[PDB]
Design a protein around this ligand. Structure first.
Ligand SMILES: Nc1nc2c(ncn2[C@@H]2O[C@H](COP(=O)(O)OP(=O)(O)O)[C@@H](O)[C@H]2O)c(=O)[nH]1
Ligand SMILES: [Mg+2]
Length: 169
């Protein structure tokens, strides 16, 4: 019946990984959540007629041992690769996340969704086209989000579950 899926939220610091996660889990926008805390959350949802239990890891970067990063990449079934639309470096970092996750999993086919967060902000430096083009080059969806207004948040997580299913199937 209920199937559990391991989702992993990755991206540079300050892009909104924790805020995205907390909107989905707790239905509010958090302004201040310590950037060094890495935690996981469970949430039950129904997607396309099938209940699933999302086990969501809100990552925070370096681990005590890199072996621990590798482990959560190996066990992770799908990845939300998050950048902020006002931070070009966070977008450029996506190249690294894509590479590293493929490398750890030794796979060319890893369920992922590219998330461009903070779309409510006017100070945009990363174009919709450049992100759409990058996602297309990986064969994955691109979704624009705002953890602040909740735009796209649910779609990003649900789409990732759909990508995981497509991969398993
Ligand atoms: N305006 C706006 N601020 C955001 C958004 N998402 C996150 N933030 C803020 O950006 C900062 C970093 O968010 P956080 O979730 O801690 O980023 P993390 O380091 O990736 O976990 C926080 O002050 C958040 O309130 C968003 O969509 N819009
Ligand atoms: Mg965080």
């Amino acid at each position: 019946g209920m199937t559990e899926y391991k989702l992993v939220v990755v991206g540079a610091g300050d892009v909104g990984k924790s805020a995205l996660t907390i909107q989905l889990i707790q239905n509010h926008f958090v302004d201040e959540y310590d950037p060094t805390i890495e935690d996981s959350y469970r949430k039950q949802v129904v997607i396309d007629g099938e209940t699933c239990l999302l086990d969501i890891l809100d990552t925070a970067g370096q681990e005590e041992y890199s072996a621990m990063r590798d482990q959560y990449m190996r066990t992770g079934e799908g990845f939300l690769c998050v950048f902020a639309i006002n931070n070009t470096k966070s977008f450029e970092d996506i190249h690294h996340y894509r590479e590293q996750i493929k490398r750890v999993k030794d796979s060319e086919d890893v369920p992922m969704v590219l998330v461009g967060n903070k779309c409510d902000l006017p100070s945009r430096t990363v174009d919709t086209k450049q992100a759409q083009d990058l996602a297309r080059s990986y064969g994955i969806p691109f979704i624009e989000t705002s953890a602040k207004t909740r735009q796209g948040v649910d779609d990003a997580f649900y789409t990732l579950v759909r990508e995981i299913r497509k991969h398993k199937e």
